[PDB]
Curated annotation (Swiss-Prot), chains B, C:
This is Caspase-1 subunit p10. It comes from the Eukaryota. Changing I2N: Mediates autoprocessing but is unable to interact with Gasdermin-D (GSDMD) and mediate its cleavage. Heterotetramer that consists of two anti-parallel arranged heterodimers, each one formed by a 20 kDa (Caspase-1 subunit p20) and a 10 kDa (Caspase-1 subunit p10) subunit.
Length: 173, 88, 88, 173
């Protein structure tokens, strides 16, 4: 049933959960007791831009990801239409959240226009760039700047172009 | 007493396409990569680790069309398998 | 007839450390990452796909010392599991 | 026994090879008949540099990787002490080799000094940089510039620093 907290996500049974622990040894990330854990997720989605076209349909992506991450047990923070400077600040704020101390993992989702250099902020144009590099995301969530997530999985999802190219080449069959 | 730890570890990034290349978004159906990732997470979170699910997502994009993209896993420092164990 | 194919697919890069960070080489024993990769390939090529072997290599570096490094898998577009099937 | 062609590599038995095909469906890379296949591997190792210190012990790495890749069924081309320009040229030459047409995969190994930007060539100094970017390696082996390896695994191994940092942070136990 999709009436539960996990919605459309297929559940792992107790038989399955022990089979995974027998298939592979002490090489799975440990999960915290469901009763006490405080898992956090952050979604930054840019739809309304100053100079670049409107990302119509982004709301479907926010709904989908938000519900997905909640189903997997994450409290989801959603932030919209931010500059690279705002994104950095929001990411720093996320790395300082005390719930990470009693969490076993995190998810970061970025959704925006993009170029080869990185993710486009609210104010981005070719004349005055407003770019958040992926390098910066890793730096803000690493063991130095986010000690609370030491030894814990950090999953980063990015929806964006990485350039102008169609990404295809022709061949004859 | 102080102990040394790796500055960067236990990361995985999953991008919507390969470097230099576009990613597609339907104006009413949403982003192709996002919807494909959700579908695969819903189906496989119970039985497969996240790295494997991301591979499966890449596989689903294998046959190109008029709007082709190839999702890319980047800068992986996961030292263990990450299972979500949904329901737990 | 011409058919479309992905410009970049079926790649995997494995680097000796994380970005910004050093990799170590013993002057008589050789590079730490290279020797660890060989050891793991020899042991696990028969039973595990290359992505998994690379994970195992990362795991072996988990406990830092005076000379720490964390090998990194980069720009992965493998759509399938790559087994070497040694002996075949 | 290590007297065979596979040396120190543990062999996959016929029982194991069929078990892998039952564990996972049509989602393994197909391998070509051992009798007819022409697998290639390239090792570029820089030891002798103009301005940067000598990479003592590199010969152990060349021996190890060369023997390893041969054991796995690859004909190994070894090129030493090359500039970024020489590396590019050698990589282009490798992507044009006709044996790739009758191969199922490839391995590329790079071993050298390195910086954040990429891999150091023979003539590298801070004054006049001689750097091969990882981006270029991918570009030279992709479906556009190497159509012979379309749909086939391309494994890239890099031994090199990626910066100056020790890669560690302190915490209290």
């Amino acid at each position: 049933t999709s009436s539960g907290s996990e919605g459309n996500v297929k559940l792992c049974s107790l038989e399955e959960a022990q089979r995974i622990w027998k298939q592979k040894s002490a090489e799975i990330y440990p999960i915290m007791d469901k009763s006490s854990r405080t898992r956090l997720a952050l979604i930054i989605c840019n739809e309304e831009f100053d100079s670049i076209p409107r990302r119509t349909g982004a709301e479907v992506d926010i709904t989908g990801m938000t519900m997905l991450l909640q189903n997997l047990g994450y409290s989801v923070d959603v932030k919209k239409n931010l500059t690279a400077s705002d994104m950095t600040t929001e990411l720093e704020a996320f790395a300082h959240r005390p719930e990470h101390k009693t969490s076993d993992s995190t998810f970061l989702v970025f959704m925006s226009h993009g170029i080869r250099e990185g993710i486009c902020g609210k104010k981005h144009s070719e004349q005055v760039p407003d770019i958040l590099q992926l390098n910066a995301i890793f730096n803000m969530l690493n063991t130095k700047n986010c000690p609370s997530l030491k030894d814990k999985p950090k999953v980063i999802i990015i929806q964006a172009c990485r350039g102008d190219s169609p990404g295809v080449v022709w061949f004859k069959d | 007493a102080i102990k040394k730890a790796h500055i960067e570890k236990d990361f995985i990034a999953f991008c919507s396409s390969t470097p230099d290349n576009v990613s597609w978004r339907h104006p009413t159906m949403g982003s192709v990569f996002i919807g494909r990732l959700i579908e695969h997470m819903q189906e496989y979170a119970a039985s497969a680790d996240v790295e494997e699910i991301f591979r499966k997502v890449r596989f689903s994009f294998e046959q190109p069309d008029g709007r082709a993209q190839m999702p890319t896993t980047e800068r992986v420092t996961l030292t263990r398998a990450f299972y979500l164990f949904p329901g737990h």
